[PDB]
Design an enzyme around this catalytic site. Structure first.
Site, PDB file in Angstrom:
ATOM      1  N   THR C 170     -24.493 -13.902 -65.875  1.00  0.00           N
ATOM      2  CA  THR C 170     -24.349 -14.126 -64.441  1.00  0.00           C
ATOM      3  C   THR C 170     -24.203 -15.615 -64.131  1.00  0.00           C
ATOM      4  OG1 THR C 170     -25.332 -13.715 -62.271  1.00  0.00           O
ATOM      5  CG2 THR C 170     -26.820 -14.315 -64.063  1.00  0.00           C
ATOM      6  N   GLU C 317     -29.753  -9.584 -62.543  1.00  0.00           N
ATOM      7  CA  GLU C 317     -31.009  -9.675 -63.274  1.00  0.00           C
ATOM      8  C   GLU C 317     -31.854  -8.411 -63.185  1.00  0.00           C
ATOM      9  OE1 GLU C 317     -30.120 -11.889 -60.927  1.00  0.00           O
ATOM     10  OE2 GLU C 317     -29.736 -13.774 -61.976  1.00  0.00           O
ATOM     11  N   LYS C 427     -35.124 -24.195 -42.511  1.00  0.00           N
ATOM     12  CA  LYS C 427     -36.493 -24.446 -42.149  1.00  0.00           C
ATOM     13  C   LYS C 427     -36.516 -25.511 -41.075  1.00  0.00           C
ATOM     14  CE  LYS C 427     -40.955 -25.824 -43.970  1.00  0.00           C
ATOM     15  NZ  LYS C 427     -41.731 -26.260 -45.163  1.00  0.00           N
ATOM     16  N   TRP C 432     -38.254 -20.472 -39.960  1.00  0.00           N
ATOM     17  CA  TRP C 432     -37.157 -20.263 -40.905  1.00  0.00           C
ATOM     18  C   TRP C 432     -36.137 -19.328 -40.260  1.00  0.00           C
ATOM     19  CZ3 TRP C 432     -37.860 -20.404 -46.836  1.00  0.00           C
ATOM     20  CH2 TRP C 432     -38.683 -21.479 -47.188  1.00  0.00           C
TER      21      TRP C 432
END
Ligand SMILES: COC(=O)CCCCCC(=O)OP(=O)(O)OC[C@H]1O[C@@H](n2cnc3c(N)ncnc32)[C@H](O)[C@@H]1O
Ligand SMILES: COC(=O)CCCCCC(=O)OP(=O)(O)OC[C@H]1O[C@@H](n2cnc3c(N)ncnc32)[C@H](O)[C@@H]1O
Ligand SMILES: [C]OC(=O)[C][C][C][C][C]C(=O)O=P([O])([O])O[C][C]1O[C](N2[C]=NC3=C2N=[C]N=C3[N])[C]([O])[C]1[O]
Ligand code: MG
Ligand code: MG
Ligand code: MG
Lengths: 528, 528, 528
Positions: C170, C317, C427, C432
């Site tokens: 990846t 993953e 942020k 956020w």
């Protein structure tokens, strides 16, 4: 094994040297000469011969000869097979030789003809030894006859670098000799670290590839101070004298043009006082007198004859070499006497040596050059312990350091000056004085030949020194005058100058060790 | 650990050296001077500073600077803590630098100010790096500001001697740079074995304690050929020039009285042809030109200026040093030209190096001095494998030996002469000719400036050489004359003199590697 | 081994399936058709052929083709021998392909003819690769020619279930591609756990034994989302299209009557907007659009054509599959638009998946459906670490959990809704916000075609968003109007509606990754 995992073996010191001239000569004095090619061939032949006897990897081969090409070939072939090499101290009493032989459990014994009468007194009680090989200087030698029957081809094995190679049984003050052993790695590191520290000097006392080597040490004491291993790595000419006769030694030095050697203060004095040395040119010679306590007067006398004299220091447990006197270029301008006082010191530590000075509690006294203490060391070529011993081994490596047993003060520049021995120290009251300075003082007496100083217990002052002297020929001076002789001197501590209880005594003879040193412990039974 | 089990660590090269003068100077050119005592204090301060950052035993610190006292302190402090030192080849392209940084997984980066523009092109893609320290030559350096806040006291740990110390990513012909690493034991053995082989020479090319050291090599290529580790063990004065400016280099050599250095054939030619060198006294200098293929004419020109010029040989995978030219005393009588031909050879193996010559089947061709073959070696300071690679590692250590990749013939006296490279060999038919001699032949042409020779496949003769030349200014000679130029020469095998298919071509420019070497593999894509 | 100790191997997915009809067809589009019996025979033949090349148990075979029966046979034969399978991402740049090939150290390479021009740019720098096999769609294919020479009999070995089977590199945001690997046990558990969770649905979005399978994903991205392993376990008909041409894809779906497939939002939009799809019957199709962020409008348009559209979620993953949208029977009554909003979510976790939501301190925020946080997971089919990496591996499995890197809020019913990415978070101050909602807002503009939002540091507010827009054809609206366009919207926190510093900019082109995604990190170098 692993080809990429390199092992420091003795066989790499012979086949991968710094230099290799196939036509360079190995000379055994007036007996034999042969090039380096034939030396390698003879090493392979001796390996084949040892294999024929059944000498395995764990076996032990003991050697009893003088200095010769045979001892140089034994220094290489026996360790390269894997077996251990036992250098037997000839100068020991036959009982001690028997003890060492039985302790090491030797299998083969290579003994010179001249040492046969000793073996006659002991062969009866010797076990574990199968074959005796008698070495001679003529054509009927059994070593040569066993070499001639083998081939000059051998494939030396590869093993762990931590395999024991040599053992020689030092004999201090323990009741019985103590066995010290070294490995292949330790010997290779020793030769590398000494060649890198004495070959790199600017102009004084350097061993390079143009030198001609000679051992004037027993060569079984401790690896001949490792110098035979170094001399063959440089590929230099080597000359072996044999029996140490000054008349022959001087002839060999003048004829073979020897430029580098090493001896003891007695041998050097014998060579200088010989009358075959008054017209002899010595201005090419490099003696390292590292036996014991190079005197200043002898150093001055040698310097007056153009000789590069410098002292070294080591012991049986330490490789041996630990310190060598090296003079910086600005120190060679000094005079007849300041050079004598620099050259006769113990010297500065060699590379990869720590050499601190400690007290009975390990407290690492400062290197101010005045306070004395024991020398403790760490080095890559120190014996881990004594063979088959455990409590002396712990006393040897107490506090994570090796204890040398000598009391010295280290100067701020790094120069070491050995003052006395630990067991010979005088702890009068709370101070520690040395018996060597008192011995030196009562030697200046015109009537005294040999002096010995030992301790004597005193209830209110611990233990105090006692003086033993030997008078000269037709010389009779009473003890009172000998006392007053030391009472004039000054510059010392304690009560006045510690001069109220010298207690000098006149003895016709002083016990000596068979090696040739004053026996103070035996003295300390006769009188106290 | 075990106090009696000695470990060969880098910290013993600094605190247990051959010599140590506390007042000896380390000089950074016209910027800084400080004694050895302050050098040790700064090493301890840098160890404390690195400990403050959180640098553990397994970490990696990467350095990107010129030659300075900072690089000498990094050569010691970083390995002594336990962390690895990554010398980053500045001369590589920024993409290759990024690859090496990501492959090694560095944590701290010490980068000089002049290399900041490179990091600007790459910092974006750099991970695993937390802190950047910027080194400057003025008082606002961050390295100095981080040293000032620490103390000059530190207790360096004791660990296994097989812990990795350095890594520098060599970059051969593999597509990506290959990482080579060494341990404490390997570096200590390297410095010991080279000091024991070059310090012991009689009169020519020896490094002793009276010398003054200067590096004129990138000092990140391979440990600066290990010489900074040796120079500090002898305790000699060290001078670091910085940016390699001939005008500054000559001034430093004349002013600091430098007597020992090492460079590459281009730097030496630049120094000699400078006009600030026509009235400069060079009769104290000892250059070891071991970069690549010291030319004979340059060696003769340097010898005419009284300079002890001798070549060396090693590579990134081999310590580096494997062979050094050492001349015996009878070889220094020769003349202006026979000395040039001896000094420009590859040299004899150094101590503890095997260096056989083999063929593609490993058959160990004889050392007759005529037959060529690949050099295969065994030494105590060879990298075991490439970092994070497995199939190139097997190709490196094929047959239980390290393969150097150079085709040479070993003379019977032991002198080595590198002829060409393995990948640059011409296996025309059944013989293997070298492209270096053909390159030398078509260079003698008065109109050719740069030449390159590569192989070209031929169905009935395998592959054949092809010649590429670059003409000089306003020089136009047709290919036929260039062919006929090589057709006059004699004394070679194959058809006539292998002169029926030279196939010379005129190319305006020849591709070069950013390092500054001819790129034959890239050439072999453009034309075939 | 131990017969009673069962090992979960890939070979048990082929010889012990859920169903096995020997007459079921594997179809390669308009090129080849063959039953399952011949498929097993060809798998055994390919195992024999690989054994003939010398492919051992630890070797690696790399594949570079489209989707075909060849890729299905490689998905089985290579892992069953024991060797690793390297799926090479074709869409990467040739430099990245070179890096992955050298990193994985492949031995054989199976490359399609159409990818030969890429290999021409790289074959020069490729090492460790011995044989190249060229795959073609005609009768002169080398894969077929190597199959014909082998036998249809083979005995597949039994090894540990923890042996690596696949690797595909990846390429996130790390500077270099990162290698992720899986074992036999992980793949078998993946197929079992997904077949047990999607086959058991009541009436919507279930894969059963009566379906006909088609991959419309690159099939080298991640195991083609594991679906080829599942389809062969059910023994269903499989159709492989090859080059992804909509004109051919629609013909294959209509002709082969495909009922189950999976694609990306762009491919589905291309298929729907094709004019060969206006009279085509789609009411049998089950697309799982799990590529990235299935839009709501596209889902509604597909639902208007009678298509069972539902989204999935996983990454390279994680197996890959981690969540799948499954609708309960009472949720299928909803209307044209509430079904669109349910189907376009991320979905509920699959069986044996934990999938908590955490904050930068790992504090496991509640699943109220409003607060956002990072997704952290535990599953039986997660990669343990990155290949040959250590510090990115620790960042991956920080806190005893795998970090996905996506910011999402989990609803109380279990539905997940991915909001943005961690590295793309704003942020501002102490809150956020996500750049995806701002990107969606300034896209509704009638004049904007492509928009990108990145962060810009602000001293008193940390970092603030910056807007980049691309205008349409002959559309010119000033930045002020674009600012005011977003200033009308409501229902957000921060100052007013965080609308005082949008900082919109008009850029003609926005950098893109070669894969086809917006490159924000490269954007963050050009402008800041
Ligand atoms: C340069 O090479 C050498 O000099 C190596 C010397 C090796 C001697 C070994 C030997 O003498 O073994 P031991 O019987 O244990 O000797 C131990 C004692 O020898 C005394 N010694 C040695 N050198 C001395 C100097 N220079 N000054 C004073 N005393 C010295 C020591 O007292 C040691 O304990
Ligand atoms: C049902 O089966 C599947 O859908 C399996 C999908 C596997 C995709 C693997 C892939 O896209 O590997 P990476 O390049 O690492 O992708 C990682 C990012 O993909 C985004 N993603 C995937 N699916 C998503 C949905 N449904 N919504 C939003 N984003 C999605 C993620 O951001 C992920 O990190
Ligand atoms: C003395 O010291 C010294 O010199 C050391 C040196 C080192 C070097 C390193 C390098 O160079 O690394 P690399 O890059 O890998 O390299 C390799 C190569 O090189 C060359 N060389 C060197 N030297 C020489 C050479 N050649 C010739 N000659 C000489 N002398 C080689 O080729 C190698 O391979
Ligand atoms: Mg002793
Ligand atoms: Mg190299
Ligand atoms: Mg991912």
């Amino acid at each position: 094994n692993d080809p990429s995992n390199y092992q420091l073996l003795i066989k790499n010191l012979l086949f991968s040297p710094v230099a290799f001239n196939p036509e360079q000569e190995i000379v055994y004095a007036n007996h034999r000469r042969h090039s380096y090619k034939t030396f390698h061939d003879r090493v392979r032949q001796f390996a084949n011969a040892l294999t024929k006897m059944g000498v395995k990897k764990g076996d032990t081969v003991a050697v009893m000869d003088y200095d010769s090409h045979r001892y140089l070939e034994c220094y290489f072939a026996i360790p390269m097979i894997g077996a251990k090499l036992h250098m037997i101290n000839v100068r020991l009493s036959p009982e001690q030789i028997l003890y060492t032989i039985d302790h090491a459990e030797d299998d083969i014994i290579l003994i010179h003809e001249e040492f046969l009468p000793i073996l006659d007194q002991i062969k009866g009680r010797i076990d574990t030894v199968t074959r005796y090989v008698v070495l001679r200087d003529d054509e009927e030698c059994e070593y040569e006859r066993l070499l001639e029957q083998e081939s000059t081809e051998y494939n030396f094995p590869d093993f762990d670098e931590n395999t024991v190679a040599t053992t020689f049984y030092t004999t201090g003050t323990t009741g019985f000799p103590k066995g010290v052993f070294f490995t292949h790695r330790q010997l290779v590191l020793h030769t590398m670290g000494i060649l890198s520290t004495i070959g790199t000097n600017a102009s004084q006392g350097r061993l390079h590839q143009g030198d001609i080597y000679m051992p004037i040490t027993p060569m079984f004491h401790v690896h001949a101070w490792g110098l035979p291993y170094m001399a063959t790595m440089l590929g230099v000419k080597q000359v072996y004298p044999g029996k140490y006769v000054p008349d022959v030694l001087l002839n060999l030095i003048e004829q073979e043009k020897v430029t580098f050697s090493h001896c003891v203060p007695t041998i050097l004095h014998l060579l200088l006082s010989s009358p075959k040395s008054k017209a002899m040119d010595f201005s090419g010679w490099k003696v390292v007198i590292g036996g014991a306590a190079l005197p200043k007067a002898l150093c001055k006398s040698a310097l007056e004859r153009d000789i590069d004299v410098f002292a070294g220091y080591g012991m049986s447990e330490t490789g041996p070499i630990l310190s060598i006197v090296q003079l910086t270029p600005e120190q060679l301008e000094l005079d007849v006497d300041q050079q004598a006082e620099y050259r006769s010191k113990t010297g500065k530590k060699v590379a990869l040596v720590e050499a601190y000075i400690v007290d009975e509690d390990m407290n690492k006294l400062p290197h101010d050059g005045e306070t004395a203490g024991e020398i403790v060391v760490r080095a890559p070529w120190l014996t881990p312990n004594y063979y088959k011993d455990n409590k002396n081994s712990k006393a040897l490596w107490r506090g994570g350091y090796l204890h040398t047993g000598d009391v010295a003060h280290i100067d701020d520049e790094g120069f070491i000056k050995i003052t006395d021995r630990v067991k010979d120290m005088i702890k009068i009251s709370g101070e520690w004085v040395s018996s060597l300075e008192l011995e030196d003082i009562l030697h200046q007496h015109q009537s005294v030949s040999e002096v010995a100083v030992i301790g004597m217990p005193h209830n209110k002052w611990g233990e105090v020194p006692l003086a033993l002297v030997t008078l000269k020929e037709d010389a009779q001076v009473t003890e009172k005058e000998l006392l007053g002789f030391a009472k004039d001197f000054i510059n010392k501590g304690i009560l006045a100058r510690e001069a109220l209880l010298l207690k000098v005594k006149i003895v016709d003879e002083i016990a000596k060790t068979s090696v040739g040193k004053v026996d103070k412990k035996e003295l300390r039974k006769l009188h106290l």
